[PDB]
RNA sequence: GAGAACAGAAAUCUCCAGUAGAACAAAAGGGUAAAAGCCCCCUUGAUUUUGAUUUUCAGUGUGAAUACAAACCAUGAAAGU
């Protein structure tokens, strides 16, 4: 007795000209950091 | 302006200004050359724009043509003009700017001479038709339709006034795609939908749909529409004899003198302030080098 | 001196960061959309990296944006979770803020293991009345200094609205 | 540049600045910002007929290109292209 009684698809357009499968300038391991933060 | 964003010298040395008219993101020049630009071979029959713009609920309505020295206006016509011919409220509603549009159309037409001929559609029973040439006859005036940048949508106020000018006799080449009650997959057009929104169909269906569901919001909106006793029946009516008015006279006659110009201009020379001398600034430069350098 | 410089919220967007594609993106999805009750729009990968297992075009992400009261809310149920406090930092100098959210089931929303646990970010776009001459297309022109958000004055109303935090240097 | 859970130099989201520092198959040089670049919608004018013109030149040919005439079409509200 009284026991309880996919959207459409929409996909963002990108303003960018550049369409090479390439990283980008910034994307380069040098700006990485020495002991970083590193939760333990 | 944070200084990591300033610009220097050279950028703005090197930077080149677009015209004036784009800094005002006013005109759309690629559009503007291809309606403008005309025939070479015809070399002074002047392509007459219909320029229709919206400023803040107001229509204008003028017909230009391009001088190396500045664009000339032929005949023009300000939907606020439509009091004298029967409408007072909501002068940038769909039915005002198709006023706006038979007004300027038979203004032309009679500052022509093509005002008995040419006479356009009264009987506008909301049908797909253009300003067709007489037989034997001088061919009716023809004008591009300029709505500058405003947005082409399907069924748009600026395609309201183009159907007005079209409906007064003007020529004004168009499609019907774009003029409301256009099915968007069926290739067919509601003429009777058409002829609704001509004459308010829309906004009357309004006005009795909030006066019986929300006197609240109908309080306000509307609320001259009910300081002059008026009701959604009524509007076919006042735009129809506006209709008769307008092509019974199309004469603009202006505004009273009004404290002429002159006046005008002593009144607002008031608050214009005129640049300052050159020897006014070395003092007032100086002025300074002696208050804050002087050690006080 | 403002009788109309008064800062409301131009839009909230949420934005789930779904590493990589499929049927995690499908439900991060469905979150969005019982989250939003508009459809979400799904976000392609820029360029490829492989250190993250993506592709170029890989439809990785999610967002969603809300304006108006509607934003108030969520924005509520979010500050809610935060417990109204918030950083020196999370604040953009031009004016908006953020933060992000773990546990996305904080926010009222139950659990239903069908769609797992998601996390967000949620970002506030702030802005005085008038911003329509920067999105328009007639005239598009640049607000004054004076009449365009700032970082000090939108924490000071961040901090008047639910006395909620500031917390740090 | 400043900002947002995992998220890190590099994932996705937002705002600000941004004369082009991009992109436009390819070599380079021109050119291009409500575009010539990016996203989208509709298309087959990359079509039919025979002439003229520019470059190379003998003012031959070929290649390429330009502006019209006569058709039949595409697109757009449209001028137009
Ligand atoms: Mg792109
Ligand atoms: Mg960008
Ligand atoms: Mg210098
Ligand atoms: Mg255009
Ligand atoms: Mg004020
Ligand atoms: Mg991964
Ligand atoms: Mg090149
Ligand atoms: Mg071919
Ligand atoms: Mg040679
Ligand atoms: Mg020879
Ligand atoms: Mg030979
Ligand atoms: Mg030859
Ligand atoms: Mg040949």
């Known amino acids: ?40 | 302006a944070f200084q990591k964003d300033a610009k220097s010298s050279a950028y703005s040395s090197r930077f080149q200004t677009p015209f004036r008219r784009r800094r005002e993101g006013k005109t759309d020049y690629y559009q503007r050359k291809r309606l403008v630009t005309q025939h070479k071979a015809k070399y002074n029959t002047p392509k007459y724009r219909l320029v229709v713009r919206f400023t803040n609920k107001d229509i204008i309505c003028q017909i230009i043509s391009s001088t190396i020295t500045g664009d000339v206006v032929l005949a023009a016509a300000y939907s606020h003009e439509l009091p004298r011919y029967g409408i007072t409220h909501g002068l940038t509603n769909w039915a005002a700017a198709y006023a706006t549009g038979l007004l300027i159309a038979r203004r032309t037409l009679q500052k022509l001479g093509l005002d008995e001929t040419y006479k356009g559609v009264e009987e506008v029973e909301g049908e797909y038709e253009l300003t067709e040439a007489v037989e034997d006859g001088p061919r009716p005036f023809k004008v591009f339709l300029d709505i500058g940048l405003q947005r082409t949508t399907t069924g748009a106020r600026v395609f309201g006034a183009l159907k007005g000018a079209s409906d007064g006799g003007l020529y004004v080449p168009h499609s019907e795609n774009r003029f409301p009650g256009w099915d968007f997959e069926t290739e067919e057009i509601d003429p009777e939908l058409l002829r609704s929104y001509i004459f308010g169909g829309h906004v009357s269906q309004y006005m009795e749909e909030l006066a019986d569901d929300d006197e609240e919001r109908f309080s306000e909106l509307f609320k001259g529409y009910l300081a002059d006793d008026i009701d959604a029946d009524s509007l076919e009516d006042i735009y129809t004899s506006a209709h008769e008015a307008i092509r019974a006279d199309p004469a603009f006659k202006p505004t009273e003198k009004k404290f002429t110009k002159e006046q005008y201009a002593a009144e607002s020379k008031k608050y214009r302030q005129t640049k300052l001398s050159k020897e006014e600034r070395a003092a007032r430069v100086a002025a300074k080098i002696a208050a804050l350098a002087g050690q006080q | 001196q403002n009788p109309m410089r008064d800062l409301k919220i131009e839009k909230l967007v949420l934005n789930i960061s779904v590493g990589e594609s499929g049927d995690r993106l499908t439900r991060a999805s469905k979150v969005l959309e019982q989250l939003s009750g508009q459809t979400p729009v799904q976000s392609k990968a820029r360029y490829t990296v492989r250190t993250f297992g993506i592709r170029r075009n890989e439809k990785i992400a999610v967002h969603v944006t809300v304006r108006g009261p509607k934003a108030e809310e969520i924005l509520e149920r979010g500050l809610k979770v935060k417990e109204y406090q918030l950083r020196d930092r999370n604040f953009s100098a031009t004016g908006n803020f953020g933060f992000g959210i773990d546990e996305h089931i904080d926010l009222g929303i139950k659990y239903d293991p069908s769609i797992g646990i998601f996390g967000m970010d949620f970002y506030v776009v702030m802005n005085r009345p008038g911003a329509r001459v920067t999105r328009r297309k007639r005239c598009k022109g640049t607000v004054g200094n004076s009449h365009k958000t700032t970082k000090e004055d939108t924490v000071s109303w961040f901090k008047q609205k639910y006395d909620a935090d500031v917390l740090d240097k």
């Not at chain 1, 963002?12 to 002991?35: I, L, Q, Y």
């Open chain 1, 1 to 40: 007795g009284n026991d309880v009684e996919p959207p459409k698809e929409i996909v963002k357009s990108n303003t960018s000209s550049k369409k090479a499968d390439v990283p980008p300038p910034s994307a380069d391991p040098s700006k990485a950091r020495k002991n970083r933060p590193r939760p333990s």
